[PDB]
Design an enzyme around this catalytic site. Sequence first.
Site, PDB file in Angstrom:
ATOM      1  N   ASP A 199       0.755  -1.211   0.000  1.00 27.16           N
ATOM      2  CA  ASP A 199       0.000   0.000   0.000  1.00 27.16           C
ATOM      3  C   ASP A 199       0.784   1.258   0.000  1.00 27.16           C
ATOM      4  OD1 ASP A 199      -2.203   1.733   0.290  1.00 27.16           O
ATOM      5  OD2 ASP A 199      -2.642   1.023   2.275  1.00 27.16           O
ATOM      6  N   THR A 200       0.740   1.904  -1.140  1.00 28.27           N
ATOM      7  CA  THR A 200       1.455   3.156  -1.271  1.00 28.27           C
ATOM      8  C   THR A 200       0.697   4.296  -0.573  1.00 28.27           C
ATOM      9  OG1 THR A 200       0.405   3.519  -3.378  1.00 28.27           O
ATOM     10  CG2 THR A 200       2.592   2.404  -3.467  1.00 28.27           C
ATOM     11  N   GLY A 201      -0.558   4.165  -0.264  1.00 24.21           N
ATOM     12  CA  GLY A 201      -1.297   5.151   0.432  1.00 24.21           C
ATOM     13  C   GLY A 201      -1.191   4.938   1.961  1.00 24.21           C
TER      14      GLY A 201
END
Lengths: 99, 99
Positions: free
Chosen positions: A25-27
């Site tokens: 997860d880049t968020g």
Amino acid sequence: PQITLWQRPLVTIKIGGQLKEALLDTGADDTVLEEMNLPGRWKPKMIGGIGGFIKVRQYDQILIEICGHKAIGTVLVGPTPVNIIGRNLLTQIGCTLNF
Amino acid sequence: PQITLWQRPLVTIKIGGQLKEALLDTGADDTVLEEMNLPGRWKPKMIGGIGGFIKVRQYDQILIEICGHKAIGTVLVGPTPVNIIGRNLLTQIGCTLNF
Ligand SMILES: CC(C)c1nc(CN(C)C(=O)N[C@H](C(=O)N[C@@H](Cc2ccccc2)C[C@H](O)[C@H](Cc2ccccc2)NC(=O)OCc2cncs2)C(C)C)cs1
């Protein structure tokens, strides 16, 4: 690997000799795992998600293998329903977004 | 472009004639934007994540420009703390995870 996003980016991670699935997860700024027993002392943290904030326990210098790549860093444990690998461990293993 | 994750992957989007800042998020199925005016009929929807669920307005077939790349898809609008581009539009600009 190169991973397309047509499906959820779920991978196997190994932490504490257990295999778990986790979302890449880049968020997420930090890595958050479902409730587990981790070693040592923890520190308090509040993290906010889409619906609001949760209190989590911070552990530091934890090894976690993410698709066979060992990362060692801070892991937050608390009431998340999915294990999320966030940017702190994604940079360690050299992950980038490409388009 | 190649985006490292030492920092939040924030990019400019152009949507309904306004430029906004939004996070490229591999962990969101959906694209969720802050309150803004969009043309169309929309549908109520409930999305959840960490912290619980929020009600959003679903607008279908919205054209977004993400860093010059044109994308069409559902955009949900509502009290999100941060503008999120989810996997429904990341696949349209050809975005992958690489390590
Ligand atoms: C039930 C479960 C098995 C799953 N369902 C889903 C589908 N769902 C619900 C989502 O994609 N929902 C999205 C979401 O919150 N995804 C989340 C993963 C998740 C999924 C389900 C339940 C709990 C967490 C993951 C997203 O990257 C979000 C987006 C974001 C960032 C800042 C502020 C708000 C939001 N990140 C976080 O919530 O990060 C929290 C942090 C961790 N470390 C620092 S902040 C929405 C934005 C649409 C995936 S896995």
